[PDB]
Amino acid sequence: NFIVLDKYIKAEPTGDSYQSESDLERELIQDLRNQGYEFISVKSQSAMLANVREQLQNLNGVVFNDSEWRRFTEQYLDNPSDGILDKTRKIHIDYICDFIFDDERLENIYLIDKKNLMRNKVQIIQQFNRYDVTILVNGLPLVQIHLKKRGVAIREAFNQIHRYSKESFNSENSLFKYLQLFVISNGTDTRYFANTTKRDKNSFDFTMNWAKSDNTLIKDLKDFTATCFQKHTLLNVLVNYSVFDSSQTLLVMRPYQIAATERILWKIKSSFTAKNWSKPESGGYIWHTTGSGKTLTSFKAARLATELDFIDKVFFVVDRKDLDYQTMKEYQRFSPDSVNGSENTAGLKRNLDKDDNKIIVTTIQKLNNLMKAESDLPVYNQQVVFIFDECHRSQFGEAQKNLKKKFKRYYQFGFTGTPIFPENALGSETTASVFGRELHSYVITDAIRDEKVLKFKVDYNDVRPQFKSLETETDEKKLSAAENQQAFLHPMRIQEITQYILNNFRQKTHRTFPGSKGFNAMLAVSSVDAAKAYYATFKRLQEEAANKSATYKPLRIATIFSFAANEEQNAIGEISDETFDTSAMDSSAKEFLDAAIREYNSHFKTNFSTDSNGFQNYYRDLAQRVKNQDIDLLIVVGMFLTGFDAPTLNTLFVDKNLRYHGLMQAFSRTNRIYDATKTFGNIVTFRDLERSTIDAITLFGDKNTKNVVLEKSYTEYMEGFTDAATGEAKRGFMTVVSELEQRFPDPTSIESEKEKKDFVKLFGEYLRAENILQNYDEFATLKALQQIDLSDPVAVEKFKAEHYVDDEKFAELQTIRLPADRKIQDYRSAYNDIRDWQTTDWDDVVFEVDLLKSQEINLDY
Amino acid sequence: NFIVLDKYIKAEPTGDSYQSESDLERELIQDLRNQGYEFISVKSQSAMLANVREQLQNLNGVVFNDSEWRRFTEQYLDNPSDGILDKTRKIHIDYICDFIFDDERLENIYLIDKKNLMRNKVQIIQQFENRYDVTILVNGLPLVQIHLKKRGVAIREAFNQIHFNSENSLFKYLQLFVISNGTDTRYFANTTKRDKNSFDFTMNWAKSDNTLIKDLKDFTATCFQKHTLLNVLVNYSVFDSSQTLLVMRPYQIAATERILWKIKSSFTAKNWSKPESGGYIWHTTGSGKTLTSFKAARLATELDFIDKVFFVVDRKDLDYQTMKEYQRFSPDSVNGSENTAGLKRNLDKDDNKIIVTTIQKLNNLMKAESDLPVYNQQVVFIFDECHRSQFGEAQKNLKKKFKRYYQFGFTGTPIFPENALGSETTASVFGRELHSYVITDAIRDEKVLKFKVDYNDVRPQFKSLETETDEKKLSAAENQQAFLHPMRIQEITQYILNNFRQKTHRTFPGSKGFNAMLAVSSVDAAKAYYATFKRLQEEAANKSATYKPLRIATIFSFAANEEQNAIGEISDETFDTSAMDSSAKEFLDAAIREYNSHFKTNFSTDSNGFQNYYRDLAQRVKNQDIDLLIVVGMFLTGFDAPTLNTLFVDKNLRYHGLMQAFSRTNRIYDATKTFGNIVTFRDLERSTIDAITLFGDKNTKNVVLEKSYTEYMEGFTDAATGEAKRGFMTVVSELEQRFPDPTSIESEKEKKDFVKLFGEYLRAENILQNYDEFATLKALQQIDLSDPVAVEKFKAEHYVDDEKFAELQTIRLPADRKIQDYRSAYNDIRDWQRRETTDWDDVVFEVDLLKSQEINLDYILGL
């Protein structure tokens, strides 16, 4: 019974008023009642607890006495020391209470029946100005629906609730700590999101629309109720399509993630019933674009496949190059000490012999090595499921041959963001030929439309005339031959590239505002020699800057690299796999790496050795420190470029010849959504990759996909353009600056309620434009210009050579009239003065909360 | 192959200087080498770790690479964040490291082989970097450390010399300490628990007849035999739920191995289900029966041929610590209820042999069930003092239903023919006495304290009732006209309130002291007393804003009557509060609500509520949150509270019940707790002597009972040790004559002589604090230069006439300031002695008594 519908006929409105919260509330309660949700009147936690007692007793076939009920309540159901995370843990992991009754007998008390989902009781209650419907599961408040007036903007509604994170609890409301899901609606638009204490997942960007399997949205509250709020749909979303990970983050899956998972599950059942196993028609493949949640989804799909009573083993297979701190932490819980960068199979052989267990997490490298050496494994004759998460190739081809030869009853599935088509299978087997049919898809154009993945701002930094010919070279033989100190690794090119990165790092990563946290960056390079050259030049130029200024704030730079198997004899599209056996590297490489590791150790007070165990532990710690921004810039060759998840990484500096799938995978390191401060990922290249970018985008889309994936120009954001995909006109920053000065020249004078509303709407566009434009070198150069003031013999230029601007460009730039930095702060404080205060409609008005919050709070020193 | 020897031929000296630490060291290293201990030279932890690597590799048949060894070291062997407790936990519980090698293979790395003890490597080392110490290494781990002192040095002063430290972190693994001077050799556990760190907890090695092995050479030839030491470290050491390491005493080890041998014997000879299959242990009250029997039970589970081991306790003996311990082995099944659900469930648990239950629950189970698979299994029963009531019935069904069994009993007061009371004798039930450790032996060994027993004859109006011996009359006098008369209760309560602090050593400024219990005749008495305490304490708070009230609590339930007659056995109280009369239940709820308000607890009136109240109460009496606990028959037979020193008695205790109740005060603590005070308001002098004599002989009373006031004031000769003990007044006179004050103590010989004399002053005054006569004398040293209000207050409060008051004024005691002068001078000599002619060898300072009289900064800060 698919819960992400193939087809759905839109419901028709009742001729009754549908404008106020009460109107939305009445129809919500009515449709839910029509859909099997008993409406009950509760006006206290005492009445809520009495109802929980009835449901839990009913569900478990037990009757508590008052003493036993009070004891269950205080020790398991509503412990006063329990927070939201404890309740999430109780719903998703510890949902069974081993309860000892007064007669000393043991009873297993379930909060939810997860095997027979429809056995659970579902009820609805209403608020006891804050119009809310709550869905109760066995009396527990698991879903809360916020209803707002039709005119109110859903983003401001959501912002008003997250305004103050002072979510305090008491003995009269502590049952609400059990909430798993929130739904915010205004009638026309309806968005859902997880109840999580993790502020890094609490922005509007993580709110989701319900949808159909073709990924078309279900925005209308009435249609949302008729689909998402069906008992069978909601209970599956809460119990099976919600993840509570090792970091104690609750994640509710998006419709596309649910659509792919149930279609894989259905296909295993189908192929088993029809005895049609061990064929490409037994499994299938999923095309979910890079960064859309493939690693989240496939692992959950694997875990749900273990629940199929007829299945014996479920292999969840990842490429070791995609491993990072968070995924390694997660896999450690299921397959201890067996998912790492080594070639060892001992862990895999041990996990396979574990009884009362079906999940096997391993790498494609370890699975290949096992199938090579072993031929008498009992697993080969068992009913086995394979879930491959982006297992690229190199090792996958060999792995497929032994798999088809040794495994007798299997269903294999693959998840990929960049499939192998014939047009890029000139030295590989296609996704379709390996796996069979495309079970579900969620393409980059769908992800961008949904704001579930960010766009790319891609630019070649053409500011080195001496080296342009090398940097614009298209011949493969010439590019590989130019990997030396006379060509690409020339001290002056490396000094020029590094000096640009040091001067523009803070601009690119939004660290320019004083109290602003900002983002961090990565630098992907051509070779181990390039990695060496850059790390050295960064250290040199940074040591030089610390001498010339005691006010200098250095950046924490790190590097990691190993030996690439096919660096000489390969292609150009696939990023070369690096071994975890450091003893394969040349003496100077190993020497340089140890020197960098010792500097890392001294700074972070760590003791990572040079050996295999040492490097593996260094890889893990490095991944975590780049993700939490302990490291400002990570220098890499081919590592942390295909699976590394870092939502606060926004800039990728590139001095490498990236092509097709490798280009998409690498650029996508910056594509994670965060909040309004992260508008897109910056791609700054020192080799011309404009053609390679368009070729890569077009391969996993069409001729138009580049207009959606790539960000617009500086002139366009300064003067205005019309988005082709949305059909709407976006006002240019200069148009907004002009209107701000004409309509509101105010020294503090402001005006009426109509002017205040008009200003908030205007300055909101300003903040959104200024923040988007921070990512533009042209805008940075323009903003830097507003600083000088001199007369007769004194200090001049410097700006020209640092911004690579001639005397002609510098002449016209002075004519550009921008508002004074104090007037912007006057507008920023005038805007903040209208923060809340408590005619003219303030309904459709949205404040830039995330963009504002980049203020000057407790940075003091 | 017993490690507590039935016979041992004393070794002869080598005839070589045996006087200095070096002499003792050479012979120790030599005898240990002769006994299979390889002597190795180690001068650093690096050399110590290299040796650990060799031993652990050898033992486990594995070879670490340097990366794997550094990883094992940092993550399991020598974690920098690990303390002594972590290492104790690793030796006794987590001794197997599930190690993942660089090739991803799993290996179970053992620190010790516990199944094949003799496979372990034993080595000896001596102090690296003047200190004299021999360390015994087990698989390279320093588990035993021997402190060697020269022959003249007093072992108590040598113990007072050494025991947080810091590094050479491998030494955090030490389990046992041995302190010797050649002549005397004592061992003790390495524990971070200061309440178990006094000299009182150091032990001598011994033979199964409990005769001591004091000589270091004989100690080495017995305790330090590889097979003996390794068993002591691995099998005869307890690391409990409170993370306290306890090394068993020889008698506890002797009883346990004799029970274990007997199970093997009877099994091999197919001679099960007979009294000749098991046996019984006579270990006096408070000697460690609950520690020993439970360990004996757990070691019996290691017998591959045994299927189930029942460790059976009386619910009456349960307290916070034992309940906490049993919860780990038999969750939610060892409590005061009648329920068998927990027991049935623990019995059905696979990969488990230990069953902890109560005699009440086991009886109820055997009554209702007859088709249990356990009845046909090879089963061991260890009964820890199951106060024979439900036991008789339990024995009937046991012999009937269990087909292959070995039953053992542990008791401090056995059932002899002279005290059968309807119940069959210990010998007829269990068979032969496998081991014994009598009160005489415990007192001699200072493993149990003596009793100071006295009838407070200060109520002439009520004496005839209080001295009545007729059973019918005593039971009839349980009313408001006789025993529960408001005046008698006011008089008894007023005495307790006025003398509580004196009895419990809370008088000196800054002293923690002890707490007390009041055992009463009936629920009506409990009510009367709790009410009078509240009344008299509310009256005192009004009459003074300087009044410091006492935390008083009470607990009681319903018993029965003359069920199986007796006044000797303490009547069992049910945990079913619904059986109580309305007024009792009413009063108890009122007291529980007052308790709840004070301690911020929420114990309800129901069964679950009362059970939780019992548990919390036990912990608060043990940690002294409660100053006085008022009881009828609860916490009188098994409650362990080493800081409880006084038992006020307004109850007719006889024989086993008298011994069991008085023993609540018998736990050893330190030098400040010389004996347990028994203050009775009913004459129990004959009952006391009758009870002592029943579990000893006609002379046992001279050992168990403390001497009189006059004797401690003027001197007496200890019959048991043949030694003359100087009286407090003789010492006071010698102090004034031989040391007028801070001049004379100028020479090295005068200092030594003053330390020996003042030591005795501190010891005698602390013994004498427990005497009403001495308290009255000390109280007189303020009173007046005319104030008839105070003179009359003194006389009435100390129940002193005009004649006694006349002579008491002639007693010339030293000035309070002069005592303080002697006390600071004494500390200055101790301070100067640690900083280092006359010989200071045999000199012992009163460290524990000095520390209680220090008046530290964590007290003077009072505003």
Ligand SMILES: Nc1ncnc2c1ncn2[C@@H]1O[C@H](COP(=O)(O)OP(=O)(O)OP(=O)(O)O)[C@@H](O)[C@H]1O
């Ligand atoms: N359902 C969801 N709810 C909330 N956050 C989500 C959801 N799906 C994905 N995310 C978050 O989005 C980020 C990207 O997800 P993930 O790493 O699984 O992507 P991916 O498609 O496998 O990426 P790549 O192609 O780089 O390997 C993660 O931080 C993840 O936790």
Ligand SMILES: Nc1ncnc2c1ncn2[C@@H]1O[C@H](COP(=O)(O)OP(=O)(O)OP(=O)(O)O)[C@@H](O)[C@H]1O
């Ligand atoms: N080997 C030992 N080392 C240290 N302390 C010990 C040892 N044996 C007993 N003790 C301590 O002595 C005290 C009395 O022990 P325990 O309660 O087991 O005595 P018992 O014989 O069962 O007494 P009772 O007759 O009152 O039931 C406890 O605090 C216990 O921890």
Ligand SMILES: [Mg+2]
């Ligand atoms: Mg991924």
Ligand SMILES: [Mg+2]
């Ligand atoms: Mg006991």
